[PDB]
């Protein structure tokens, strides 16, 4: 998705809003099914691209829809994918070193007791390799 | 920085941790010169330090990561987005009271600029390489 965002970004910065819009729009579609997102600065960047291009073009209605979607994402209690893998690595590394686990534990058992990550959470290594460097 | 990170990732997947650590660590101090590349480098360091049985460096790395993630600053996109929402709602004769109240509170507390940054500003300033 990043080569497309790259091009959409340059096009938008030059002022080719209509050319840019389609690129942001397909990148949005990619993310929304094939990942839901993953980590939410890229969705937000995409929606910012859409909102700007729609305003310039000017579908203020479509721009307002983009803003709504963004504010929902921003308002939702969505942890960031790396928070669970780090809590787990921190609980584990505290054991290896004979140190306290219970604030990192209690936090991982609240993300679990409220549904925000799996019991066994994803691991640092899992997310490391699955991350695309595009 | 990306060449160094993808090269580090592939050695980590290959199981060559000492080699990959050297790259992750160098990629870290080049970023010294949006928490995702940092978080990922720290995950690279924490995974390699751990495999090489340097658990303390790994825990240190994971400590920074938990710091970066505990950040209490508003998401940078929040204010630009409220501004856009208020402006567009007014233009279109729709309700802006809630979003405007939220923006005004951020402005009053000094958590954003008093005409906030625009969506275009953040679009420009963001780096994808």
């Amino acid at each position: 998705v990043l080569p497309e965002l790259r091009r959409a970004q340059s096009l938008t910065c030059t002022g080719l809003y209509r050319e840019a819009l389609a690129l942001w729009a397909n990148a949005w579609q990619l993310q929304t099914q094939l990942g839901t997102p993953s980590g939410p600065d890229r969705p937000l960047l995409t929606l910012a691209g859409l909102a700007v291009c729609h305003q310039e073009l000017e579908d203020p209605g479509e721009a307002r829809a983009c803003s709504e979607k963004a504010l929902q994402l921003l308002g939702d209690k969505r942890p960031h994918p790396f928070l669970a893998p780090f809590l787990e690595a921190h609980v584990r590394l505290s054991w290896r070193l004979g140190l306290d686990k219970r604030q990192s534990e209690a936090q991982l058992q609240a993300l679990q007791e409220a549904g925000l990550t799996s019991t066994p959470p994803p691991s640092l290594k899992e997310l490391l390799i699955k991350e695309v460097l595009d």
Side-chain angles (χ1 to χ4, degrees), chain A residues 15-74:
Chain A
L16 293 171
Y17 301 112
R18 192 152 285 285
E19 211 176 333
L21 179 69
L23 298 186
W24 294 120
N26 296 318
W28 178 253
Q29 169 76 21
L30 289 160
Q31 301 176 71
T32 190
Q33 244 109 327
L34 321 143
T36 317
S38 219
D41 302 356
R42 253 190 280 275
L44 290 176
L45 186 90
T46 309
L47 289 166
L50 293 176
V52 169
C53 290
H54 282 137
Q55 277 181 82
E56 300 290 359
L57 284 176
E58 44 157 68
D59 321 310
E62 287 302 304
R64 185 167 186 277
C66 291
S67 290
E68 181 59 37
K69 189 48 189 170
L71 293 171
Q72 289 173 17
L73 293 178
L74 288 163

Side-chain angles (χ1 to χ4, degrees), chain A residues 83-104:
Chain A
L83 172 66
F86 276 112
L87 288 177
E88 170 68 53
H90 195 261
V91 165
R92 162 171 269 94
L93 290 162
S94 287
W95 197 260
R96 171 72 171 84
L97 282 165
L99 299 171
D100 189 23
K101 278 181 305 120
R102 73 213 133 111
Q103 213 72 0
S104 259

